[PDB]
Design a protein around this ligand. Structure first.
Ligand SMILES: Nc1ncnc2c1ncn2[C@@H]1O[C@H](COP(=O)(O)OP(=O)(O)OP(O)(O)=S)[C@@H](O)[C@H]1O
Ligand SMILES: [Cl-]
Length: 310
């Protein structure tokens, strides 16, 4: 017996039988792909281990209200579009603020939006789109808002039908999703169908608000924390953090400062961030700004960090 040789032989057959990623060692550092979707969060992009959401996969983003799920998803779309991709937003919440979306860099005008009459119609419309192979990314707002038709329409006290709907739906949309090469983000709100999504998801993000961006003493935004509780394309359980200002989305410069520091590219003498010899400022915010204005800097930092990792 040769354990490691026997185990590898095992794994190999396991992945063959159920797909790559069926099993993997946690420390394992996986081989990156040909063009993921920058989550808009450098840290998260890293936690996902492939620099962003995997295309042609089902992505669930759950968490409480105000935790930043929609924000993240928007950025996802933006990038998808920045890459000349076509986007679709299946809205069953009617909560979208396109003005903010634009600010996150979404081309709202070219963005397709549907506002279904029932959970069925929703997913159906979603299926039909996906399988046109024109969409790079699609978003479904509120797994919960996918209420069956029988219930929306007047129906008696019943079933366990919302889950079945969601289940069957995913069943076919996945095949398509894969052939299409389109990523499907399902925003799930922690306040029914998530039962299925748990198993169909390739990636599952547990998003929640941790801090109240205050800087010194005033409301700015909030610090989010995402845990990749499920990851079928890279070791799971990675966590990342980042800032979302009010009105502004995920602070790229905020991620850059933070990750740049923990990775020694930007030195932080107490109270004063410094990089490569140039002074960046006292207090994250001053640094953030500096990086915001001096777009050349940060870009360097964005490169440097990118390299050392993935
Ligand atoms: N329309 C908006 N205008 C200004 N800031 C917004 C807006 N929407 C979201 N934000 C910012 O993003 C934070 C919340 O992130 P969301 O985009 O709401 O993601 P989320 O909470 O999962 O989505 P919900 O609550 O289902 S909409 C807010 O606290 C603000 O910092
Ligand atoms: Cl990003």
């Amino acid at each position: 017996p040769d354990r490691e040789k026997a185990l590898e032989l095992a794994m190999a057959q396991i992945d063959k039988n159920f797909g790559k990623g069926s099993v993997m060692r946690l420390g394992e550092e996986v081989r990156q792909p040909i063009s993921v979707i920058p989550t808009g969060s450098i840290s998260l992009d890293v936690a996902l281990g492939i620099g962003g959401l995997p295309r042609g996969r089902v992505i669930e983003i759950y968490g409480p209200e105000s935790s930043g799920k929609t924000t993240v998803a928007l950025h996802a779309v933006a990038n998808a579009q920045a890459a000349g991709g076509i986007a679709a937003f299946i809205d069953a919440e009617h909560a979208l603020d396109p003005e903010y979306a634009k600010k996150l860099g979404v081309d709202t005008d070219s963005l397709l939006v549907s506002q279904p009459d029932t959970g069925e119609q929703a997913l159906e419309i979603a299926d039909m789109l996906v399988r046109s192979g024109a969409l790079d990314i699609i978003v479904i707002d509120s797994v919960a808002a996918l209420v069956p038709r029988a219930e929306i329409e007047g129906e008696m006290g019943h079933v366990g039908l919302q889950a079945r709907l969601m289940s069957q739906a995913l069943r076919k949309m996945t095949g398509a999703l894969n052939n299409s090469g389109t990523t499907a983000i399902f925003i799930n709100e922690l306040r029914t169908g998530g039962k299925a999504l748990k198993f169909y998801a390739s990636v599952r993000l547990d998003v929640r608000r941790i801090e109240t961006l205050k800087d010194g003493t005033d409301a700015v935004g909030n610090r989010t924390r995402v845990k990749v509780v499920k990851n079928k394309v890279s070791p799971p359980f990675k966590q990342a953090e980042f800032d979302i200002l009010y009105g502004q989305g995920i602070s790229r410069e905020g991620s850059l400062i933070d990750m740049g520091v923990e990775h020694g590219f930007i030195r932080k003498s107490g109270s004063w961030f410094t990089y490569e010899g140039e002074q960046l400022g006292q207090g994250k915010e001053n640094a953030r700004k500096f990086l915001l204005e001096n777009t050349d800097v940060a870009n360097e930092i964005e490169k440097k960090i990118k390299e050392k990792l993935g």
